Design a protein around this motif. Structure first.
Motif, PDB file in Angstrom:
ATOM      1  N   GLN A 137       0.846  -1.193   0.000  1.00 25.14           N
ATOM      2  CA  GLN A 137       0.000   0.000   0.000  1.00 25.14           C
ATOM      3  C   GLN A 137       0.875   1.233   0.000  1.00 25.14           C
ATOM      4  N   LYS A 138       0.261   2.410   0.034  1.00 24.09           N
ATOM      5  CA  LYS A 138       1.031   3.665   0.045  1.00 24.09           C
ATOM      6  C   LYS A 138       1.505   3.859   1.466  1.00 24.09           C
ATOM      7  N   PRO A 139       2.632   4.533   1.630  1.00 22.98           N
ATOM      8  CA  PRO A 139       3.188   4.814   2.964  1.00 22.98           C
ATOM      9  C   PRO A 139       2.681   6.200   3.301  1.00 22.98           C
ATOM     10  N   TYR A 140       2.802   6.609   4.547  1.00 23.43           N
ATOM     11  CA  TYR A 140       2.375   7.951   4.885  1.00 23.43           C
ATOM     12  C   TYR A 140       3.448   8.958   4.387  1.00 23.43           C
ATOM     13  N   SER A 141       3.109   9.804   3.408  1.00 18.08           N
ATOM     14  CA  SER A 141       4.044  10.817   2.898  1.00 18.08           C
ATOM     15  C   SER A 141       4.159  11.868   3.972  1.00 18.08           C
ATOM     16  N   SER A 142       5.345  12.382   4.230  1.00 21.89           N
ATOM     17  CA  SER A 142       5.450  13.402   5.271  1.00 21.89           C
ATOM     18  C   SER A 142       5.511  14.816   4.694  1.00 21.89           C
ATOM     19  N   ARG A 143       4.867  15.767   5.371  1.00 20.34           N
ATOM     20  CA  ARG A 143       4.907  17.161   4.966  1.00 20.34           C
ATOM     21  C   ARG A 143       5.059  17.927   6.281  1.00 20.34           C
ATOM     22  N   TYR A 144       6.053  18.798   6.309  1.00 19.16           N
ATOM     23  CA  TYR A 144       6.332  19.652   7.442  1.00 19.16           C
ATOM     24  C   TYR A 144       6.816  20.949   6.749  1.00 19.16           C
ATOM     25  N   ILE A 145       5.925  21.952   6.713  1.00 21.38           N
ATOM     26  CA  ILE A 145       6.189  23.253   6.075  1.00 21.38           C
ATOM     27  C   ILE A 145       6.880  24.092   7.092  1.00 21.38           C
ATOM     28  N   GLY A 146       6.433  23.927   8.328  1.00 20.52           N
ATOM     29  CA  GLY A 146       6.961  24.687   9.430  1.00 20.52           C
ATOM     30  C   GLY A 146       5.763  25.331  10.102  1.00 20.52           C
ATOM     31  N   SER A 147       5.239  26.398   9.493  1.00 23.34           N
ATOM     32  CA  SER A 147       4.091  27.122  10.024  1.00 23.34           C
ATOM     33  C   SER A 147       2.928  26.257  10.473  1.00 23.34           C
ATOM     34  N   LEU A 148       2.432  26.592  11.663  1.00 24.06           N
ATOM     35  CA  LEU A 148       1.324  25.925  12.342  1.00 24.06           C
ATOM     36  C   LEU A 148       0.024  26.020  11.584  1.00 24.06           C
ATOM     37  N   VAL A 149      -0.199  27.147  10.922  1.00 26.39           N
ATOM     38  CA  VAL A 149      -1.411  27.345  10.138  1.00 26.39           C
ATOM     39  C   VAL A 149      -1.195  26.658   8.808  1.00 26.39           C
ATOM     40  N   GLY A 150      -0.017  26.916   8.243  1.00 21.12           N
ATOM     41  CA  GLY A 150       0.350  26.334   6.970  1.00 21.12           C
ATOM     42  C   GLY A 150       0.089  24.864   7.055  1.00 21.12           C
ATOM     43  N   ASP A 151       0.628  24.247   8.114  1.00 21.19           N
ATOM     44  CA  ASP A 151       0.470  22.817   8.391  1.00 21.19           C
ATOM     45  C   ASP A 151      -0.925  22.483   8.839  1.00 21.19           C
ATOM     46  N   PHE A 152      -1.537  23.286   9.704  1.00 20.05           N
ATOM     47  CA  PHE A 152      -2.887  22.931  10.092  1.00 20.05           C
ATOM     48  C   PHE A 152      -3.949  23.178   9.039  1.00 20.05           C
ATOM     49  N   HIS A 153      -3.560  23.735   7.909  1.00 11.42           N
ATOM     50  CA  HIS A 153      -4.538  23.944   6.851  1.00 11.42           C
ATOM     51  C   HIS A 153      -4.381  22.804   5.867  1.00 11.42           C
ATOM     52  N   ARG A 154      -3.144  22.385   5.629  1.00 15.22           N
ATOM     53  CA  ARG A 154      -2.905  21.287   4.704  1.00 15.22           C
ATOM     54  C   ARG A 154      -3.650  20.093   5.225  1.00 15.22           C
ATOM     55  N   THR A 155      -3.453  19.800   6.508  1.00 15.06           N
ATOM     56  CA  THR A 155      -4.139  18.697   7.150  1.00 15.06           C
ATOM     57  C   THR A 155      -5.671  18.805   7.066  1.00 15.06           C
ATOM     58  N   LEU A 156      -6.215  19.876   7.661  1.00 16.16           N
ATOM     59  CA  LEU A 156      -7.656  20.183   7.692  1.00 16.16           C
ATOM     60  C   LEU A 156      -8.359  19.915   6.360  1.00 16.16           C
ATOM     61  N   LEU A 157      -7.753  20.318   5.255  1.00 17.29           N
ATOM     62  CA  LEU A 157      -8.376  20.065   3.983  1.00 17.29           C
ATOM     63  C   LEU A 157      -8.020  18.653   3.542  1.00 17.29           C
ATOM     64  N   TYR A 158      -6.829  18.147   3.901  1.00 18.57           N
ATOM     65  CA  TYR A 158      -6.379  16.813   3.431  1.00 18.57           C
ATOM     66  C   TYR A 158      -6.228  15.626   4.386  1.00 18.57           C
ATOM     67  N   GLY A 159      -6.826  15.677   5.561  1.00 14.73           N
ATOM     68  CA  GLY A 159      -6.679  14.548   6.446  1.00 14.73           C
ATOM     69  C   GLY A 159      -5.239  14.474   6.915  1.00 14.73           C
ATOM     70  N   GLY A 160      -4.901  13.359   7.536  1.00 15.26           N
ATOM     71  CA  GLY A 160      -3.541  13.221   8.019  1.00 15.26           C
ATOM     72  C   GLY A 160      -3.451  13.495   9.500  1.00 15.26           C
ATOM     73  N   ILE A 161      -2.253  13.826   9.960  1.00 17.72           N
ATOM     74  CA  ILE A 161      -2.010  14.107  11.358  1.00 17.72           C
ATOM     75  C   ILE A 161      -0.718  14.915  11.504  1.00 17.72           C
ATOM     76  N   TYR A 162      -0.865  16.138  12.025  1.00 15.64           N
ATOM     77  CA  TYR A 162       0.236  17.063  12.297  1.00 15.64           C
ATOM     78  C   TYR A 162       0.372  16.860  13.780  1.00 15.64           C
ATOM     79  N   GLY A 163       1.560  17.086  14.316  1.00 16.02           N
ATOM     80  CA  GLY A 163       1.778  16.946  15.744  1.00 16.02           C
ATOM     81  C   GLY A 163       3.123  17.542  16.090  1.00 16.02           C
ATOM     82  N   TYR A 164       3.347  17.798  17.356  1.00 13.18           N
ATOM     83  CA  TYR A 164       4.587  18.380  17.788  1.00 13.18           C
ATOM     84  C   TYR A 164       4.531  17.896  19.202  1.00 13.18           C
ATOM     85  N   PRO A 165       5.597  17.242  19.705  1.00 10.81           N
ATOM     86  CA  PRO A 165       5.478  16.772  21.071  1.00 10.81           C
ATOM     87  C   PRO A 165       6.668  16.924  22.002  1.00 10.81           C
ATOM     88  N   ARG A 166       6.495  16.331  23.182  1.00 12.20           N
ATOM     89  CA  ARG A 166       7.485  16.322  24.268  1.00 12.20           C
ATOM     90  C   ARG A 166       8.891  15.908  23.740  1.00 12.20           C
TER      91      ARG A 166
END
Lengths: 333, 328, 328, 328
Positions: free
Chosen positions: A238-267
């Motif tokens: 199957q397809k693997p999860y392609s990674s996208r990390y633009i940097g910006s929180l909105v930039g990233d939270f908009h790509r996700t919001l329209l395209y599914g996926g999961i953005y995260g930043y952690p401990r």
């Protein structure tokens, strides 16, 4: 009859403006058109910030516009940000029945060689706000600054009315919601007006994309390391999860919001308390996708239940589609 | 205003472009097309800003050039038949133009970019020839219109134009790269930064890590020594936007390594050898570092086919060298 | 299918301006400044919509220009008695830019176009280095000006940009006049009127009728005349907006007359020689019109000294010799 | 120095439009149908500024009103007949819309504007009534037509938008004339001047003086007292753009007299009644001025057809009575 021609652009036959809908809406609510002036006003400041960004300290003067664009709306009886070391915003006579926190942009570094930035606002209506003591006025001369009383409560996020952000990038899509739907607007550049671009954009269920700053991998706990190194090893044809990390929180939270996926930043480097703040930006975006469907949790629980108890404390954030949010949690447990 | 801001609004694009001939006898026609390009881009810019697109950007560029010209011919991403805009309108230029790049996540909209390259053709010949549905069988003894086959030697100038959060054009003609920010209000390409020089060290990598479990092992170990330090130092931070120009831009300014590598299915790269690797190579090479397909520096690869795709790695020399070992 | 031009470009000013150096051997000095000018107008224009004008407009023109490689001095209204552009820029050409057209009218509901004229010091002068504060907006003397004050033997190009309900840039370098409107979409001047010629039977008149008495014996009769349709045919209708550029612009495209007679406010009027009257008379000769001061043709009246007011009679030949038929 | 940004308490039309209609009964319907009129006016200006833009201006209008179902059919400028908006949008209220006034300026490059009116059909009926010169009686009319007709004492809101060197937006309603100078950059209407009123004085007349040999022997005399007055002194100034909104706007501000007298062509005069002179007079009225057809006010007339013109004279309470004194 139904012709048109070769504009292939100018075809705004049904210009559903931000205002058009934003006004055709308040026809239901005892908010006495005080909201509208604020939301519409935020619209104003965002429309200008979009220009600062593009240009002709960005975040420490973009707050300066907030006031300039809100000293008229009693709704923002008092307002807020992130950059400043003083909660002032407007004094006395212009009060209302709610409060709105405003996050200038989304990241000191982010901006330098950016490609995306935004502002994250969330409106809190403390049905039983401030209430401290009598409100003084009249006297004058304020050398050692303008006295004021208490610095009101830290609302949580379930009594969060309206939330949204405005991604200054490629377009400047105004995105907002309320307890009845999610809506997005593009900033038609010529006539400087935010046209309705999307009606209740609900996140899809399978979101096969992953946004995590692997760069500081040798800092994530092994348990969490079990999420990263493993999602890029499919385990079936199957397809693997392609990674996208633009940097910006909105930039990233908009790509996700329209395209599914999961953005995260952690401990990691910082401390397991988190990185991203809680009330000022984790909350305002956890509310949007919440409507949209997706989820947003610190591995343990949802993020609009935790009631902050200070104006800065960091919190880890993981967010995107349900299946990909509930999934990862079976790792840190 | 927004940081530096207006500080730069003195001597636009054309100010410099007219400064070059006055300052280096430039074949004055290069300044007409290198100008119909500033406009041609500004158009697609507010078209990308929202206000069918993959081809509209060409249909702008065409008209916005088919007129003036100066070049003689222009081309694109999908034109395996370099649009020879009449042999009649010129003689000594061929300006390949790539409408955009990373044509997918533009549907949500974060970043994008147009790329191009002026090639002074030592070789010429005419055009025409498209034989139509009539009588005869197979035996293609044809190549069609091409000669898109000689970078390094013929690339006279090169640049891209980023459409996102700003519409920073960026260009080089031999003597350094020069970047230009477009003043929204009074639509003018204002010189922002000059002689950009990409960072000698740099700790930012941009690869599609998501398809790591599909690369040659010689490389896959590389991926780990970016995650797992050793000498005891600062970590290697990372970032993939989704479009070359955004990444390359972000690399040319902050430093790093970037490069869709070769894997099982794309045994040979992705990004093309002329169209999007050569023009983008001559910039990073005019700004300090080097560009290369793993082994050889990207400008030795005589373009020998149609849509020739080829692995690419680009950025600060030091970095594309650490992987010089890992490669092979 | 009706595209064709509806996705073209439409030859913009920067376009048109470059092709000119294509025809000559001009190393783009004049061509540099014309664009440098054009930009000063775009901000000064966009600023007028209210996004002290006379003052800002003057710094706004200092920047875009001053630093232009080919100036031998430049100027702006209030600057009483000469201005010199630092060695570091130098050159020869001089450009007289008087910010806005008037300092009273606009606020009403008028227009306010700016005015320019690049003289070419057939010989030239200026001083050296140094500087001694001069930080005041009030320094002037009997310094033998001349420099700024360049005869109508020089003036090689001229023009203005009218900030009405459409920013119009009009200018003649010496082969007919040309106008270019400003399309707020593409942020650029699209050539819109090519080569102009005012109409001969200029059947319209613009005159500040209100200051009637002030007018001398012979003029007032001519006035009741333009009103009392002589032989008994067609009357002359009226329109007067209140500002030079505007009143002069409908006077260019459409026929008629506009003037500022030597009345009681001493034998002169309110319009200066080199500044408002010298350029405007030069656009008209080429606009198949004619410029007269009353007594002789302005275009060749010795400037003598500074601010030299001169009543102006500007318009299409026939309709200008007419009142000129009142002498000897 | 700061004075433009330094206002605080800033408001955009929307602000003001909700601010008042929240404290003072009105809201929903009116507000929005005035907002989508603000917007229609921002969208039109661009056509003037240039994106033959008459018909288009009506179609732009219908669109930006259709989803505000509180208005019915409206015979607007040049329109052949008022169209109803598909039911459901049950518009129990009628607005007259005037796209571009002075049929000429649009190609002439000069001030132009749009004028509107909100009539609240106190007697419900907002339905069509086809009128195409048929029959009925063999003689003449008896019964009222289209209902569109609604006396000046019962018209709630009326205003105009000027597309001159600026897009100032003037509106009045129940309180005064407010004006909003469209902020070119971001696309919002800012309130610049609260409840204003003319200055009683009026040293400015604005009639088409050049047509003099034609007016009535009584008005003809009158002009002469403007030029050469009793105690003489500081004469009048004759600022006349010709465009109905430009003239009315320099007036309403500065102060003066502006008029369209009876002429030769026919007692009408030209300008229409409730489409053009009625709202203008309604505004100028609460703006403190006065308006009348020489002998009788406009806010006291109601024709017997679509195009019943009326001499118009508007200006300060002074200037108007003055010419009113030349009424026998």
């Amino acid at each position: 009859a139904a012709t048109q021609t070769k504009a292939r652009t100018r075809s705004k036959y049904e210009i559903e403006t931000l205002t058009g809908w934003l006004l055709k809406q308040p026809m239901a609510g005892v908010i006495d058109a005080e909201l509208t002036i604020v939301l519409s006003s935020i619209s104003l400041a965002c429309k200008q910030i979009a220009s600062l960004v593009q240009r002709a300290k960005l975040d420490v003067v973009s707050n300066e516009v907030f006031s300039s664009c809100l000293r008229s709306s009693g709704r923002t009886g008092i307002i807020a940000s992130e950059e400043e070391d003083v909660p002032v915003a407007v004094e006395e006579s212009y009060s209302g029945n709610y409060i709105v926190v405003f996050d200038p942009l989304d990241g000191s570094s982010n901006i330098d060689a950016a490609v995306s930035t935004g502002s994250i606002f969330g409106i809190y209506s403390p049905n039983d706000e401030c209430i401290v003591d009598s409100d003084h006025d009249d006297e004058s001369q304020l050398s050692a600054e303008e006295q004021r009383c208490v610095v009101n409560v830290c609302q949580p996020g379930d009594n969060l009315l309206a939330a949204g952000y405005c991604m200054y990038s490629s377009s400047v899509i105004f995105v907002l919601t309320i307890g009845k739907g999610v809506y997005a607007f593009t900033l038609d550049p010529m006539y400087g007006e935010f046209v309705l671009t999307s009606e209740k954009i609900q996140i899809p269920k399978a979101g096969k994309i992953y946004s995590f700053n692997e760069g500081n991998y040798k800092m994530w706990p092994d348990k969490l390391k079990k999420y990263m190194d493993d999602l890029k090893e499919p385990g079936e044809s199957q397809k693997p999860y392609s990674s996208r990390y633009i940097g910006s929180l909105v930039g990233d939270f908009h790509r996700t919001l329209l395209y599914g996926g999961i953005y995260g930043y952690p401990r990691d480097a910082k401390s397991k308390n988190g990185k991203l703040r809680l009330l000022y930006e984790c909350a305002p975006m956890s509310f949007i996708v919440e409507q949209a469907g997706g989820k947003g949790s610190d591995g343990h629980q949802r993020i609009l239940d935790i009631q902050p108890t200070e104006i800065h404390q960091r919190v880890p954030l993981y967010i995107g589609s349900v299946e990909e949010v509930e999934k990862l949690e079976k790792y840190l447990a």
